[PDB]
Paper text:
FlgA possesses a typical signal sequence at its N-terminus, recognized by the Sec-dependent pathway, suggesting that FlgA functions as a P-ring assembly chaperone in the periplasm. P-ring formation is a key step enabling the bacterial flagellum to pass through the outer membrane.
The conformation of FlgA is different in the two forms. In the closed form, D3 is closer to D1 and forms a compact structure. By studying the 3D structures of FlgA, we identified a pair of residues, R113 and S190, which are within a suitable distance for cross-linking with a disulfide bond that keeps the structure of FlgA in the closed conformation. The disulfide bond forces FlgA to stay in the closed form and constrains the movement of domain D3. The closed form of FlgA is reminiscent of the PapD structure, an immunoglobulin-like periplasmic chaperone for P pilus biogenesis. In the PapD structure, a deep cleft between domains constitutes the substrate recognition site; however, the cleft between FlgA domains D1 and D3 in the closed form might not be suitable for FlgI binding because the C-terminal domains of both forms of FlgA showed similar affinity for FlgI binding. Upon binding to FlgI, FlgA may adopt the closed structure, since FlgAR113C-S190C showed a strong negative dominant effect on motility of the wild-type strain.
Residue numbers in the entry: 1 to 198
Amino acid sequence: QDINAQLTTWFSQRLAGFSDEVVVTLRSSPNLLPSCEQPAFSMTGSAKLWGNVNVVARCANEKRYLQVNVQATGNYVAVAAPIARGGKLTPANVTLKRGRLDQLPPRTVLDIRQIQDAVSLRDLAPGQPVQLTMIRQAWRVKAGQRVQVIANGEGFSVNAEGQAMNNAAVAQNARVRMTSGQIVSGTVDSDGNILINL
């Protein structure tokens, strides 16, 4: 109830915009947790957001890996009308439906900005959750294009220009050759800009 409410609140904050109702519960053994009253929580390399995830509880020098369960509820993209192979996901064939995110199939599309100019790999029936393995996104960024690189670090923000070295869809990884000749990589946002965390 103290660790849970800490986790419930910690995840509720991390899953802002995705879910407005998050309930976390510790699953691992309570005798392995770090001795601090309130520990800093680190995500485990973006392995998962909800369901049964792993969190790094840190106490100055002592590090413990915990297992938790995140019960999130938010919006996801559902097939609203039947869709055919190589069919374009449109406002007519798809819609935003509220449901339990931790009960959704993996790589389910949550944000409508992921599926601008997306096409279906297979036939889809109404109500099915749109998964990124079931679609082909159009390339947001093309190799050879000049792109803006945005690096938000701790205490600072960097804004730079580079050249895209590969074709990449939104939320996919893009490699960029900086003006200085260095090669850096990040993820493509809806804007076509390249975001780098640290």
